[PDB]
From Swiss-Prot:
Outcome, altering residue 70 to A/E/N: Suppresses the toxic activity
Binding residues for AMP: 75-76, 116-118
Location of the active site: 75, 118, 172, 175
Organism, as annotated: Ricinus communis (Castor bean)
Effect ascribed to mutating residue 92 to A: No effect on the toxic activity but Suppresses the vascular leak syndrome
Binding residue positions for a carbohydrate: 3-5, 10, 45, 136-141, 190-192
Sugar-modified residues: 5, 231
Protein name: Ricin A chain
Reactions the enzyme catalyzes: Endohydrolysis of the N-glycosidic bond at one specific adenosine on the 28S rRNA
Biotechnology section: A deglycosylated form may be linked to monoclonal antibodies to produce immunotoxins exploited in cancer treatment. However, a point mutation should be introduced to eliminate vascular leak syndrome, a side effect resulting from endothelial damage.
Primary role: Acts as a glycosidase that removes a specific adenine residue from an exposed loop of the 28S rRNA (A4324 in mammals), leading to rRNA breakage. As this loop is involved in elongation factor binding, modified ribosomes are catalytically inactive and unable to support protein synthesis. Can inactivate a few thousand ribosomes per minute, faster than the cell can make new ones. Therefore a single molecule can kill an animal cell.
Top-level taxon of origin: Eukaryota
Amino acid sequence: YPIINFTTAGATVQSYTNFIRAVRGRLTTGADVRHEIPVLPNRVGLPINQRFILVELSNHAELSVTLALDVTNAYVVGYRAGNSAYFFHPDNQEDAEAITHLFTDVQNRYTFAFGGNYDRLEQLAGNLRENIELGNGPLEEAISALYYYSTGGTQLPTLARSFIICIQMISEAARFQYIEGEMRTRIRYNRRSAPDPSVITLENSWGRLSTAIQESNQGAFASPIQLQRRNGSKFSVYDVSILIPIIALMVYRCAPPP
């Protein structure tokens, strides 16, 4: 499986930008593009030898962890840290079988009893996304927390908070140029802030947007989708045009019309 590398150690807007770019390149094949927006590979009929990509994360503290993402949705399904690998609770027989193809030589394999969805993680973390800071520092720390989990160094709430940091700074950033942009800003000015309403709203609407777009009539949505700006004010989306600068990847929802 392909491996993309990134380190928080001396991270710059450029290093992070090159990183996210390489991830998108490994997530999509460039076969499916609609209205100038790349669509992730359809899960139906996808060979297992092309199912995942690995994201190796390192930090100034010289520690490393490797995240395993599913190319069909960019979701983080588990990670490896030294002699141990942990997987979120599979959601169906297919996914449970699939993950057995990852980190095949790790001494110890574990499968969490909870899922990797935000609702669950926030609950375990004891904080919502709107109250969990993002930036190079939080990522630096997250990497450390994931690494010391198997040795009893990381408490569950802190591990959950860590996943939430990694998922938004890697997967969400890959999905949205907008979100990638906010992270770049954080890195440039070395600031540590929780995600604003525009970020949360986008994170929550990825699937809907992907469908609205793909099911659109020449790019015109049947029904508008409500998003939020940074000051939390409402603003409707009726067309894919205004999303081109915003969404970088879509989950496959349907076949494109002729």
